[PDB]
Design an enzyme around this catalytic site. Sequence first.
Site, short mmCIF file in Angstrom:
data_model
loop_
_atom_site.label_atom_id
_atom_site.label_comp_id
_atom_site.label_asym_id
_atom_site.label_seq_id
_atom_site.Cartn_x
_atom_site.Cartn_y
_atom_site.Cartn_z
N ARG A 82 1.09 -1.49 0.17
CA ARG A 82 0.12 0.31 -0.33
C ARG A 82 0.86 1.60 -0.19
NH1 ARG A 82 -5.06 -2.78 0.63
NH2 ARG A 82 -5.26 -3.85 2.44
N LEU A 83 2.14 1.50 0.20
CA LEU A 83 3.19 2.36 0.00
C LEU A 83 3.48 2.49 -1.26
CD1 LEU A 83 5.15 1.71 3.73
CD2 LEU A 83 2.86 2.98 3.80
#
Lengths: 204, 204
Positions: free
Chosen positions: A175-176
């Site tokens: 998700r980064l």
Amino acid sequence: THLTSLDPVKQFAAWFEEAVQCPDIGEANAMCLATCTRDGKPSARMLLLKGFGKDGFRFFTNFESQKGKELDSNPFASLVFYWEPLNRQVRVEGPVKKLPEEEAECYFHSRPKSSQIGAVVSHQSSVIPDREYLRKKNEELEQLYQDQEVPKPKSWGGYVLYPQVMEFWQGQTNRLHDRIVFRRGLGPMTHRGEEDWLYERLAP
Amino acid sequence: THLTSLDPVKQFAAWFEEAVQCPDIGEANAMCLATCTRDGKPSARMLLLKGFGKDGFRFFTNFESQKGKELDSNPFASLVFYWEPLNRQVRVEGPVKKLPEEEAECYFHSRPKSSQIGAVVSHQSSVIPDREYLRKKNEELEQLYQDQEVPKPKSWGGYVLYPQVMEFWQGQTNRLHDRIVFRRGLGPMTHRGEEDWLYERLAP
Ligand SMILES: Cc1cc2nc3c(=O)[nH]c(=O)nc-3n(C[C@H](O)[C@H](O)[C@H](O)COP(=O)(O)O)c2cc1C
Ligand SMILES: Cc1cc2nc3c(=O)[nH]c(=O)nc-3n(C[C@H](O)[C@H](O)[C@H](O)COP(=O)(O)O)c2cc1C
């Protein structure tokens, strides 16, 4: 960073090449063009990139369509390339110039005859009664233009978007997401690219 | 026409279902959101549809991002769904309302803990120094929130777009793309849909 080039047009070229070689991407040059009225009403639609380089990103359309009316009134646009199989997105923002009529004419005549006739028949985004209307007019224009050159409609041509902002997004499972944004223009997190470009990393 | 419903929200549902069942579409709910400043500078980016119905199309984001700042200043938007393997496009235009804070809170807490922590850590679209910065802050917040509820950031929530225009585009090999546009509102080519909707066919 993890970049191929600090000229974002060349970074775009690198990613575009990878999208073209991906068998799960049908049209690597499909992009979403966002425009708006001067009064701030946005619109957006898919179309195809048809040339890119130092001068910017080229596309062709009927000037009497919604997009053409908005660009002519308000010559600023944004583009989104989304390549889901590679988890990649490219965003471009910048001003637009209409292409010279001679350049549009030469491009128009390089296209298949069926596409040229398609542009004549279809007053893009005007109202029509049914499907058959279109098929019938296309076939009538095929008759008219047998063994003859199709003239470019006065209302048809192109635009070039000169990039001022370009963002490269690479999705990540954790998700980064990696986001590197280039802007034409020094803080400790802002870096010099090629020519007048600066770049920085953004939070996802 | 060739439609499933003359309520375009239900037509959307029919197409969305077909996109979800297509094995060559990764995220059927991925859409391009176009916004702009009141002064008419457009921007656009991908995000995910997270609920739809009679009230419209829902999505979630950081309000301090570009999109949030533009929507708060200028609450009008456009969406594009593009499903290349089915040669289909859906365009939606309409006004936006911010969702009630209680509804956002309930939705936030329904998401995986990693997504919740992701929203805290990432001041979406703010500048950061490098990749590792993000990984490190995420892990520190994982420590902070072990066995504890993650609070929704004040700057995080959702919006709902109430549709006023919806276009369904089905691409065709012969270039005579089918375009049926619904607008809220009689000419001979304009037809009554459900509720206050009218529809018509457009030239490609
Ligand atoms: C993959 C794809 C590519 C498209 N390419 C173009 C294009 O290159 N030029 C164009 O005028 N319309 C293109 N369209 C059609 C547009 O989505 C739109 O229907 C049309 O240009 C009218 O837009 P407007 O009414 O918003 O101006 C394309 C649609 C799809 C799905
Ligand atoms: C498939 C996909 C889905 C995305 N979904 C979202 C989302 O649901 N919410 C969100 O805030 N950003 C989402 N993003 C990230 C946006 O493209 C963008 O990076 C971010 O929201 C900041 O946009 P802004 O700076 O223009 O406001 C998504 C990106 C991709 C490729």
